[PDB]
Design an enzyme around this catalytic site. Sequence first.
Site, mmCIF file in Angstrom:
data_model
loop_
_atom_site.group_PDB
_atom_site.id
_atom_site.type_symbol
_atom_site.label_atom_id
_atom_site.label_comp_id
_atom_site.label_asym_id
_atom_site.label_seq_id
_atom_site.Cartn_x
_atom_site.Cartn_y
_atom_site.Cartn_z
ATOM 1 C CD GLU A 125 1.862 -34.021 63.268
ATOM 2 O OE1 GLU A 125 1.670 -33.488 64.383
ATOM 3 O OE2 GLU A 125 0.946 -34.363 62.487
ATOM 4 C CB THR B 169 -1.383 -24.367 62.101
ATOM 5 O OG1 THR B 169 -1.110 -25.719 62.501
ATOM 6 C CG2 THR B 169 -2.178 -23.693 63.181
ATOM 7 N NE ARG C 202 -1.359 -34.492 64.645
ATOM 8 C CZ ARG C 202 -0.445 -35.285 65.192
ATOM 9 N NH1 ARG C 202 0.294 -34.845 66.205
ATOM 10 N NH2 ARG C 202 -0.156 -36.455 64.627
ATOM 11 C CG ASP D 184 -0.095 -27.758 53.472
ATOM 12 O OD1 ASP D 184 1.110 -28.056 53.341
ATOM 13 O OD2 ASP D 184 -0.817 -28.251 54.366
ATOM 14 C CD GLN E 38 0.213 -35.701 46.044
ATOM 15 O OE1 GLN E 38 0.369 -36.864 45.661
ATOM 16 N NE2 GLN E 38 -0.965 -35.086 46.015
HETATM 17 N N1 LIG Z 1 1.684 -25.451 70.443
HETATM 18 C C1 LIG Z 1 1.792 -25.386 69.120
HETATM 19 N N2 LIG Z 1 1.017 -26.180 68.345
HETATM 20 C C2 LIG Z 1 1.237 -25.983 67.013
HETATM 21 C C3 LIG Z 1 2.132 -25.104 66.422
HETATM 22 N N3 LIG Z 1 2.084 -25.197 65.057
HETATM 23 C C4 LIG Z 1 1.183 -26.118 64.897
HETATM 24 N N4 LIG Z 1 0.640 -26.677 66.017
HETATM 25 C C5 LIG Z 1 0.046 -28.046 66.161
HETATM 26 O O1 LIG Z 1 0.993 -29.180 65.906
HETATM 27 C C6 LIG Z 1 0.337 -30.125 65.123
HETATM 28 C C7 LIG Z 1 0.849 -30.200 63.741
HETATM 29 O O2 LIG Z 1 0.493 -29.021 63.039
HETATM 30 P P1 LIG Z 1 0.016 -29.139 61.548
HETATM 31 O O3 LIG Z 1 -0.460 -27.813 61.146
HETATM 32 O O4 LIG Z 1 -0.886 -30.314 61.526
HETATM 33 O O5 LIG Z 1 1.382 -29.569 60.781
HETATM 34 P P2 LIG Z 1 1.466 -30.070 59.193
HETATM 35 O O6 LIG Z 1 1.558 -31.508 59.335
HETATM 36 O O7 LIG Z 1 2.693 -29.494 58.606
HETATM 37 O O8 LIG Z 1 0.273 -29.572 58.576
HETATM 38 C C8 LIG Z 1 -1.115 -29.654 65.110
HETATM 39 O O9 LIG Z 1 -1.679 -30.124 66.333
HETATM 40 C C9 LIG Z 1 -1.069 -28.128 65.181
HETATM 41 O O10 LIG Z 1 -2.236 -27.401 65.675
HETATM 42 C C10 LIG Z 1 2.938 -24.243 67.245
HETATM 43 O O11 LIG Z 1 3.773 -23.398 66.903
HETATM 44 N N5 LIG Z 1 2.691 -24.473 68.606
#
Ligand SMILES: Nc1nc2c(ncn2[C@@H]2O[C@H](COP(=O)(O)OP(=O)(O)O)[C@@H](O)[C@H]2O)c(=O)[nH]1
Lengths: 54, 339, 344
Positions: free
Chosen positions: C39, C44, C174, C196, C200
């Site tokens: 998260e 992203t 997500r 990424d 994992q």
């Molecule tokens: N508002 C906002 N949403 C974000 C940001 N970075 C990611 N998101 C959202 O937060 C959630 C988690 O991002 P994600 O890319 O799934 O995190 P991961 O689990 O590390 O891959 C998703 O809904 C993303 O679109 C940010 O800086 N701001």
Amino acid sequence: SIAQARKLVEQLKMEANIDRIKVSKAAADLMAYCEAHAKEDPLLTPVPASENPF
Amino acid sequence: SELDQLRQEAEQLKNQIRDARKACADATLSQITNNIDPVGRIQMRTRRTLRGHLAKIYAMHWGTDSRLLVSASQDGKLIIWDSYTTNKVHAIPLRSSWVMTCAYAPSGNYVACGGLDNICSIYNLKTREGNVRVSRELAGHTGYLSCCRFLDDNQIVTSSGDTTCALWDIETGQQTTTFTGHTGDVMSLSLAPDTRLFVSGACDASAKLWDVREGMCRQTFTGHESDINAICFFPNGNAFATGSDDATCRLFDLRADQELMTYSHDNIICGITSVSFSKSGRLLLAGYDDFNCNVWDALKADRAGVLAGHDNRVSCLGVTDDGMAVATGSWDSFLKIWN
Amino acid sequence: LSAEDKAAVERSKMIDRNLREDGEKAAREVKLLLLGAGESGKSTIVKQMKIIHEAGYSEEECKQYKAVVYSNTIQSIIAIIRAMGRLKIDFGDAARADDARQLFVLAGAAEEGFMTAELAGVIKRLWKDSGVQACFNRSREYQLNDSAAYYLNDLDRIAQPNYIPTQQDVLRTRVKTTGIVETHFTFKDLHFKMFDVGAQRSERKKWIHCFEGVTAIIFCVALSDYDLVLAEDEEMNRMHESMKLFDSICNNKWFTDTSIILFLNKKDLFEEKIKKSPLTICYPEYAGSNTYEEAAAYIQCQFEDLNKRKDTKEIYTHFTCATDTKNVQFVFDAVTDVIIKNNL
Ligand SMILES: Nc1nc2c(ncn2[C@@H]2O[C@H](COP(=O)(O)OP(=O)(O)O)[C@@H](O)[C@H]2O)c(=O)[nH]1
């Protein structure tokens, strides 16, 4: 819960109810198998170095 | 209440297993072997060096012909070698280079590998149209593929960081059986001589015997104080060796349902990444983090010697079916054939 | 000996040729490994690289996220609704309790996302409700999706029969992935490789060394996590976990020759949250004024301090909003320069 427990039980039963043996028998057999093939082991028996494989 | 029957029944079961093992502990492998002619210390030399990989090599598997072998490196290629001439019979461009394992099929028709992609990729070497492109991709695992072994062109078993092993039907690509049980990453697996059952080593520091056809775990072997990275069956199928992060290798007997021996030496506290048996089962070869491959007497427990010739750690080992040679892969990108 | 089996020798040589060419191409490419708690924005950033430096998303690739968008949308409303119980919050209008029940009746088990004329209204009714809104504000007291409001507010556009996800929608999705994700891209003359590992779900310790010698690690941190906990340990603050992880990856023996790049992500969420909630929930010894400028700086100084080889390695921090393609473009384009300069 009752379901998982049962799932565990039947597994423990599987692990539990088996034809175990003593270590001396088990061990003897290992010495046995080994001593039986000691000559057929090229890594134990330096095969006639001339041109075989490598 | 009803849960107590089960709970109480569970508790006693573990003890009978405990006590059952204990009861059979009438002697030690060392005791009964103490009176054997020691292997002495045999010397091995590099006969062939296989160069072609750029990245670290993570696995290698000898073909049943004891001549052709596969090696996987994270340079994105599975190279199939002619151990004798050193010719590259192949180089398969992997759809993902985060490769952790490769498996040469008993038949010689296929080969497999997989890794951080959680996929086991089946490559057909006989693609009459010419060369190789993925024929099958076995998806189901939700953790990295740590090891895979074909039973035959039609089926292959895989271990995974997702804590399971699995049997698959290549022809259809469906996961035939899921072997649940381990509570840690399964790092290695070994097929019993007949392909009836197999053992798996995992991060919960425990091995496990699984009935392929029954898809159930028969026994569970503990004793390692840390992860198990490598596992190998004693040539007869009634014992197996495990290589662990805890700097030790251990022989466990299947019939006596317990550890028989531990192979370790002070001034060796790095992990073992691979273990293989000499054709007779006398020598246990273990690939170490310190770039060396140690050869132990499987019966006496002493170091019969050591194969030194790699610059980075030895990641994978392999002794030919005909016992004629040993292959050692490494993070240095070279493979060496020892004799 | 000495014959026509040499045909294999020329083929082996052909392969060496291919290997060698392919190998040359591999020493001049840039490899980036994304890390950080789930998260945090890793997924992203990966997707951004495709929108900015490669094809971006096509109507087709985008329509394939239609299912995930519907699922996230439903998952969000349900999580908020459930959250009202735990926190005891009433509905603004009592007739919503029906839509709440209907939401679960309709929103069946996993197949894909449904989105029907009926589910759409049920959801639109619930999100809009003053009670649901009240709870949504208290989203710091339960697990809640980041893109909840995003998707819910745009429900009229989303629930449409002839819907096609926009890239933004895609960026906001997500989808939890277990297999390592890689995206290749050419930019500023050199080739790039971003990985990424994602979810994992295996002990990190087993595959971490696989990335030893990566050009650089981009470590994402969700700044908005400062006032959040772990729904399993309760006492464990999420910002704290991310730090332990960072400390582990920053000073990790495998990354000694790797450039560490923190992405203090979700700055846009942090900016609004810092107004409401104090940094002192995360860092109780924080005596600074509870503003973005100062608190964002305090957080940056806390992670960069984890670095023990402070004399050997420089931590290139950047404040991002991973869902903003422009911000990511610039920041990445600034990452690309340090990288170029710093090493190459
Ligand atoms: N508002 C906002 N949403 C974000 C940001 N970075 C990611 N998101 C959202 O937060 C959630 C988690 O991002 P994600 O890319 O799934 O995190 P991961 O689990 O590390 O891959 C998703 O809904 C993303 O679109 C940010 O800086 N701001």
